[PDB]
Amino acid sequence: NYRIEHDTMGEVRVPAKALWRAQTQRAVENFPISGRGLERTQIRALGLLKGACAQVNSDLGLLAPEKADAIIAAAAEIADGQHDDQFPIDVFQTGSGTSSNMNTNEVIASIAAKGGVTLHPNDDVNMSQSSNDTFPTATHIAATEAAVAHLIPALQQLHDALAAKALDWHTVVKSGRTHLMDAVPVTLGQEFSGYARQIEAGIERVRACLPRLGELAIGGTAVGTGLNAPDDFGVRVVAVLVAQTGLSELRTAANSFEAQAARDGLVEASGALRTIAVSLTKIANDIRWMGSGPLTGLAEIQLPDLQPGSSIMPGKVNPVLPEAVTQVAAQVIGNDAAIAWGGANGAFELNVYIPMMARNILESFKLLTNVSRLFAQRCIAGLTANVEHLRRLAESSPSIVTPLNSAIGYEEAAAVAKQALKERKTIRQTVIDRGLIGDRLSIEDLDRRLDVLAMAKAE
Amino acid sequence: NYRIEHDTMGEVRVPAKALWRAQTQRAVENFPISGRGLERTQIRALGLLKGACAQVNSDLGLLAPEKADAIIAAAAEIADGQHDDQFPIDVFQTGSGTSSNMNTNEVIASIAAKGGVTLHPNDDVNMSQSSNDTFPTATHIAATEAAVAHLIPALQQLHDALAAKALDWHTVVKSGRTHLMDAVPVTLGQEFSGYARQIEAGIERVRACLPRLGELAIGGTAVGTGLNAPDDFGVRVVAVLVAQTGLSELRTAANSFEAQAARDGLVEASGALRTIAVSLTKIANDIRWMGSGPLTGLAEIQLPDLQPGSSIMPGKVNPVLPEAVTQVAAQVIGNDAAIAWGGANGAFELNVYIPMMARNILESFKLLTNVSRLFAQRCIAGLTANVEHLRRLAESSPSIVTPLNSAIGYEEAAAVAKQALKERKTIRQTVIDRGLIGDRLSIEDLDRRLDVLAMAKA
Amino acid sequence: NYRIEHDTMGEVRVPAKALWRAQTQRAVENFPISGRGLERTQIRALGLLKGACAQVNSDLGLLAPEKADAIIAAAAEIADGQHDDQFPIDVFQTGSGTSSNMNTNEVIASIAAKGGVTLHPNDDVNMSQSSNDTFPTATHIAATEAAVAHLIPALQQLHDALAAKALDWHTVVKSGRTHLMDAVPVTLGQEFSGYARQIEAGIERVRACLPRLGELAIGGTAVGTGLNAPDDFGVRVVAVLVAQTGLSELRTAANSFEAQAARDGLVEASGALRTIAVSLTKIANDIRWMGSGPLTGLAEIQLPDLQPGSSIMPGKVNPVLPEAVTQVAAQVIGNDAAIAWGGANGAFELNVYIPMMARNILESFKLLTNVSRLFAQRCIAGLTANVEHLRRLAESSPSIVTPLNSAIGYEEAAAVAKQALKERKTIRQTVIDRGLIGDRLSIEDLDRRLDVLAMAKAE
Amino acid sequence: NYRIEHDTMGEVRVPAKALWRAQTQRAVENFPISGRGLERTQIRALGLLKGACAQVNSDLGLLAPEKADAIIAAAAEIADGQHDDQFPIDVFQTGSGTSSNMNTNEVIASIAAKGGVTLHPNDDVNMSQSSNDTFPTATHIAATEAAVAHLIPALQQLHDALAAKALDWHTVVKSGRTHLMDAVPVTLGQEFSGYARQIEAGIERVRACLPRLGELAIGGTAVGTGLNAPDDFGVRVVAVLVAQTGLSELRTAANSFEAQAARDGLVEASGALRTIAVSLTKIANDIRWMGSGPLTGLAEIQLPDLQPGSSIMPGKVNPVLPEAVTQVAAQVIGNDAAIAWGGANGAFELNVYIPMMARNILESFKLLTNVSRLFAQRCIAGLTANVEHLRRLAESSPSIVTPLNSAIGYEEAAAVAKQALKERKTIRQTVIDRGLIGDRLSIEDLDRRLDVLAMAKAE
């Protein structure tokens, strides 16, 4: 049921059917901490990087073409997700990600062996590389792809759903709320245009971090000097990665020492994700408050029904998607604090918090991507406004008596506001009931002064 | 103008009327970062400690009685707040608080010189001491005093105001809300008993941290070994401090190395303050939402008017104290993250983040103390309930069909709640209209089960 | 392929072999956010609670004995870990944990149906219950068990390893370091007694939070009033749970409204875990710095070799366990910020951030437990001291002039330390060269005061 | 000693010599919380804004020129700092900053009264304004000025000091450190070029947030609709503010509802400040570790002496500026968490956490500005390298034996590395001592293979 493998420290017993070897098995026994390993996106990025490195080593005549072809074929299988069960090392491993780097090299060597090609995991699969430049490179590839190919399109879909509702509800007049108290009129469309701008500003924030998030350490080797790698190894690997993936945001780092001694690009990108979580909290909280009730809440809008709300209270339906959004936002805030903590504590030539920082930034990208699409499609798209109820409260608000001052005086306007609340009537009906229609104020003049939609000043 | 002072590094120009000397002046020029120095409570604790150290050196015959008397007299003036303008060093100074320690030593030496007593700031005022044991000792004295003499009585005052409302509003029935949606009846008194328990648990949390917050490093000197101090210096200084402050929570550290290499007691105490901030956010948010509107909100309660809110919108009054509470809570959360960051980054024999950690913990104590008293007196005490509106809300919730589950089942009760909402009819009428009155449920049993105050089970 | 199931909202297509029903399937389609569900400990606690609830309903004659026997049998299989693949709902679900509660109810109903017993998931399995009191109860059961049965024994094992080193290295003199600069002598044993106290205070912190962490909401039902449950349901369920788990820390909540409107006990417990993470960072950082180099570092101690560190740099072995400890500590800091965020944002009768708060607190417990045992066994236990090098460092520090303050004063002692460093001479020789030997200080008194082990003042 | 003032709530006793009136005095009694009010920069921004508003109201013929001139003259005095003792309201005030807005209006009215001009604090000084658009406008003016006029020049000064040291130390060869262990050679110049890039990337991060940090709410009034303000009030006020201050980054908000319902621009800018704090922690930690000792540390560099280090240990000097930097960084991390907390908790038309968010963001700008200049001038500029010691350790490192493999074999190279450490000799001397110089390897060939500066691959 087991086999014997070797490294510079001795013999190691490895499960017979595992594609990994001695160094991965040592890491399995050294780090049983979370029971969770690398994600699909991380394994994909490691496979992409190893294939591109083999291509460049072959191009420079440093690696035999048959060996390079075997790495490229094996690495493509890893990048496609055919061997995700061959990456058992915990996230909480050696801080440079050496163990997961060794894990990729050993799995490539075992795949190639099945095709009759002998590869040395270090001498062939890790040629011109170090763990110190490859694991952060794979991390930054995965984070750049998560930003460009998944998060930005998901945020754009949420922006478009919010902007469509802002247009549908352009004339849906309602009463404004400041400090949670009755204020002057607004439209439901104006509030949703505000939410749309928060998401649009979110996309701008992600785009602004891309020139530094896309910076790759590849070619810097052990300390950033590029020792034991060709001088143009970095630019050549990046050129191959851009041609294969289409991820134009990928680039060699401006400074090779900053690219390995620190992970400031991840701290920066997390700050953008954290700001999006802050924006999403406001939007989701306002939406669940607008849908509150039906009889003891605000009852401004109706959220689409997604599932029975209670195991005990029958008929009750809860805002389950705003709840999922606010919980994701809390997770992003938490992950952000762990990333910054890891980011600050590098030492000299290497920051050794990379696997922990990678786990947190990639999870925040994933959670925000998936919850934004669900929020857009299963909540925002199907919202219904209680138009008549919203207009009635705006027309019954004591805040709209101020344009009556030049006709009846502020004293009489305050008396109108007081009687309207007491009798639960509109300001218009109260002005009529108090016998104020005459030479001083006509009904046409009253409807002009109390035009709540005009007070909202919609475009 | 200026005068010339000196230290082991050379000459320094010091302002003519300043009671501080060379090393304080170097610190004034080295750290112009925030423009803020030690607080009144920090200067008081440094004053108390220097006086206590002089008393013990005198008792052990290590310092001449007249020299000790001059330090005790000068340290009493510092602790009293007579020389607060003589402490100009920034909070963001050397991480051990060496500069602020030398500031106390130099100011004491100058006050004593006015009385004709010559004291060496290092050899006499700092006898048997180090900044490594004195600055964290003064920090832990200040934090222990802030917890025991100020925060706990303020939280007790808030608890008592909340518990009094819970008693007054014991039968004030209203609709419960879960996920912000209409739920089964509760009383306003039941919710306020919930808030009172949160504050009561807050006091319990502060009291549970006191055995480690009260631990003092005094006696450990430079690295915790107690070199250049008598073997019982620490226990004797703590005994003088306990007698003078009445703070029995003050004690010698269990391990003299942990007491200087780490500031874990401040990280622990901040965690309790952070939980109180979390409890206060929920209480303040619920109260401002209960007072929201009136027309566009819940309009459940009325908050006392504390100041005009708007001129453009006549008579608009805002929940200003809940706003002050939630902003304070945000600050406590922030200060907590700063404290934990500093606490983790100690190295070998000393954690060099003490002035920053002291600033943040003492501010969190002060903010929570002051806002809790204002919240209790200017908001909670004067709250009034809209009793008739609240009863109408309790009776309008469709979730009042819940006690009928044992009689008609969950699925049939769901069909009742949905039909009642669609046809704009009561739960009672919908049960009758769906022909549910029979052997399993009589009309008298239905009226008994639908009583909203009885449903709240007060 | 699929079968038809139903809830109060309508029909749902459920996979043919799934033990879950309509409401779990709705939750599978509503929340595909993280791709991760409840942990083994959460499923165990839900299993234990459902069994205990069925036992009490049976004792009070509210549920037929055969129906109760089937629930107890099915709930025991769930708690044992036989049906973990039957819990597919995401962590980022409805904030009350309604979906995961219905998941337990539906799986129990399907297991019992295999034995010829017909159970209604709401009316029978959820009898006298709500998700509002059961999901936070299962969370607090899991967190209390993690604290008492797992974390405290792991921290005790770490304390014992640190205290054993403190005893072995009692007279291993070295130079103290403050601000990273040369200070007066200490022993390696004295520093390790400091680390042992930090872990001992960590256990004290966990124990101090237990009276509130152990508080269970069971019996409070929908809003905390206990409507649709017997008056003593809570005390009876807690008594069954204490008897079955041996966890005397489990108790009924002091206030049934605070127990559901807030999750303050989890915020409090996280604060204790965060302080342990802060203590572990200092201990792990000091140990990796003591083992640094050897040539370019402090080279004070030797850490046991756990795996090869480099192939390019032969024989380079890295402090992999301190790296795992400091990365875990960063994760605990992050999880703590997420927990506090969720805890503050409750509204009226319910805090709807429980699944997120549960994920983060239980992960922090698991990470600290597992890394503390590995740190104690694979790092602390096998540490070796470079005794001769350490004594030379103690003797080389110029700060050894400190015990002469009572004899020559601070100012004269400063002139000694500075002259000794400038002329590359010892403190002893500089005191002689500056003509300081006389009545105030004899040569025998100087040699007595300059003894580095005596200066460390070891008990 | 006191006088009677009035508002819509009644009579208020005010100190006789105070320039503030009834509404400010109410706020003094309502909020005694921190004992700290608005900073100099906040008062300056409020004065600038009120003067610009009076100018626009006069230009549009809405305010009498004599009244406008009196506001402009009074507001200029406030902006200059002549009346900072007239702003006693606590930071922890009403969340919109209404109290501080009223404070500015009342002080302006009292200054103008001394010149014989009667102003109504609301009708004249607050004309076309609301607290909801003015306090966040003043906050964003102060934050934009702090970024552009103070932080960016202070960071540029720190970058230039670090880059100058990187050039001075271009050939100062030393041994690299990864995981705190001995690694291949680097230069001290290469590490400082890394630090310089972190600060340069910091400036880029601050510049990237300016398009949204500079957005002003002015003209949006109570709810963002612009009701009771001229349609072009916002663009006209911003035009005046840009012309007077030269702060071209100031602009009207893209969306008037997003500009008042949220403070996402402050959360975003804080994220940039937090990333700078993370970068500064790494730079300051490396510098104090490089300067550690002088005899029990790394002793790579010498920091300039700034003050006596210890009250007890004479002659000892501590890295006081790296300590001030790392403490400031911790404060920025803390302030960042408070800003995000406030940012997420807005409701409907207004975020009511503005005074707390303003305090924290402006303090972080101030702390980073002042500590960067002090770090550049009192620490970085005067650093000295221990050149001979650094070269000796690099030439004695077992890591540099790898280029000997093609001459003597890896087995003999490992034996050379082992003997070199044992005898505390250079690799070069050990190769000679082992009698390896011959036909297989000449001394010229040995010096070429062991050229440590060439191994660092300096530009």
Curated annotation (Swiss-Prot), chains A, C, D:
Pathway: Carbohydrate metabolism; tricarboxylic acid cycle; (S)-malate from fumarate: step 1/1. Keywords: Acetylation, Cytoplasm, Lyase, Tricarboxylic acid cycle. The record marks E323 as: Important for catalytic activity. The active site is at H179 (proton donor/acceptor), S310. Pfam families: FumaraseC_C, Lyase_1. Changing S310 to A/C: Absence of fumarase activity. GO terms for cellular component: cytosol; extracellular region; peptidoglycan-based cell wall; plasma membrane. GO terms for biological process: fumarate metabolic process; tricarboxylic acid cycle. It catalyses: (S)-malate = fumarate + H2O. One of its GO terms (molecular function) is fumarate hydratase activity. Substrate binds at residues 96-98, 120-123, 130-132, 178, 311, 316-318. HAMAP family: FumaraseC (MF_00743). Belongs to the class-II fumarase/aspartase family. Fumarase subfamily. This is Fumarate hydratase class II. It comes from Mycobacterium tuberculosis (strain ATCC 25618 / H37Rv). The lineage of its organism: Bacteria, Bacillati, Actinomycetota, Actinomycetes, Mycobacteriales. The gene is fumC.
